[PDB]
Amino acid sequence: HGFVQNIVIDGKNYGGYLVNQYPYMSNPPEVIAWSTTATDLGFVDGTGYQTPDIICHRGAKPGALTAPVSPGGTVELQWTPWPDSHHGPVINYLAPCNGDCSTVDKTQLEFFKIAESGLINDDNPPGIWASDNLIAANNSWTVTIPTTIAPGNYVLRHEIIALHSAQNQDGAQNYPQCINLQVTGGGSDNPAGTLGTALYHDTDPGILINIYQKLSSYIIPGPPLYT
Template identity: 70%
Template sequence: MSISKIAALLVSSAALVAGHGFVSGAIVDGTYYGGFIVNTYNYMPEVPPNIGWTEKATDLGYIDGSGYSSPDIICHKEATPGALSAEVKAGDDVELQWTVWPESHHGPVITYMANCNGDCSKVDKTTLKFFKIAEAGLINDSNVPGKWASDELIANNNSATVTIPGSIAAGNYVLRHEIIALHSAGEVNGAQNYPQCLNLKVTGGGSAAPDGVLGTELYKATDPGIKINIYTALDSYEIPGPALYTGAAPGSATTAAATTAPATTATASTVSASPIQSSSSRHLTRTRTARPSYSPTRTPTPSSAPTSAVTTSTVTVVYTKAPSTVTETATATASSAPHVTNEPDTQNASSPADVTITSTASGQSAQSSTPASGGDDSKPSVSGNATAAAAPPAAPPAAPSSGDYSTYLSSLSAEQLLETIRSTLKWLVSDKKVHARALAY
């Protein structure tokens, strides 16, 4: 690929954030686990093992009311179980990371769990019975169409955090996380469901085995929270699906003062009368550190017990253009941050590592792990306030005013090309607020 095409690809990455999204990964007990990258993995002959369920919605589309009785509503189109499971202690948090979400697609954010009663990688999805562990709907309707849970997810860096109920029995579970877009829900089958699933191995906990509902019976196209016109003032809004599990963590339900939910959930939910994010909506308002990007390939790292010590890790970004390679190193310090693992069967917390991100002409990225200087028992940490340790390359010559950027880019030296790419990335990520992970698509 020519230099001009590479530069054009970088600039065009900004347009990729305009579409519907999907859950690209999750932070479980502080450790990052990659999910199923629907717009990449579907085109690979061999998919890297991950905790996400495979699905065929390569158009990043949805399931509408006509598909509520179809198995596609369970974990999206033609979904099959993920190969791995992320281990989590009952009572701990799982942060679900969406690639992006359109601001116009207002609606509730709902999360369920279902016990696999065995190996989740081999479970028949049509037998799973889901119980609701978190829900959030209309937050404030003072300004139509109102502020919704999806808006809070966007404000929280396209992420939602849920708490695994502390009372459920240990075992293998499927976590089903979903946004329902209501911007066209005034008509039957106008609501758009975007279900996403991943596998968890729950440890600890109690002995509770909550009753559940088959995925094909969660919704009806005429449910009050499904068929609704959000462009008129709403006196109330009923979050779709079965009642919230009574053992759900406090704060796992968030509604506006004028919003109602099924009566059976009243004793298990906390109501917030304010549109301001607060502890009553903690599954959508968790403050996060910088997340790692995902890639089609990862190298597992050995497990070790993390400590609370503050350590320093190094991020090395390698820009490759045959036959030369230019490397830039940055150092950052923070109290805690997620780490990437990808081990067979069950992914476990890993020892600290330097993460190497390699960008190639195809636009894909790869990560590898090597021991960091913090020691085997150090906890990995990355901060968004990274300070470059490498000397900056020579500044490129001024761009031609004629707009002949192909000739201009071809005339640059390796150092000058690197500076141009760095400036473009800074403009996309820092100035235009494009999430860094979106640049990999």
């Protein structure tokens, strides 16, 4: 259980959507982060993969603000302290807003994968995952925005999937966090985009999986990485 508390871009903090404060507030602040109803700090499991909840988490609505990112610049997302138990991949997708991200229909966003990290080492099952990398980096993930994509406004959909219960149907725990970015530079790729509700299915080999046994490979779920 956890959520993105803060985002660092070009030497300043953009406060995140504090899901344990703002939902109780009724005049909460404008942020670059999407609002959610996930006040349990919980997940979207396999029962929700073909519901709108999977896109930017349960009941999610666009953030009011959009953060400019320098060309090929870094977006550092800072989580609440991530449990060692919650082993699994950290995956990053962009969808174009074709306009102000604050007014987009989330149901029509088309995501391309810009980064994935999965099973790093399996010497000691369940092993060392991207989630363990995120913990070792004091609960922060660094995303580099490609230079080869068309500039414009994009939703960054940032996700940990926890696999600690994933040996059972609908056991995998998706933690998607969305923020609004204004990508800059000279690129011109418009990568083939996957609907939120076509990202994952509940029987994918990276999703329905027993992590506690020796694993020879791990197929990171979601569409193919763009390069």
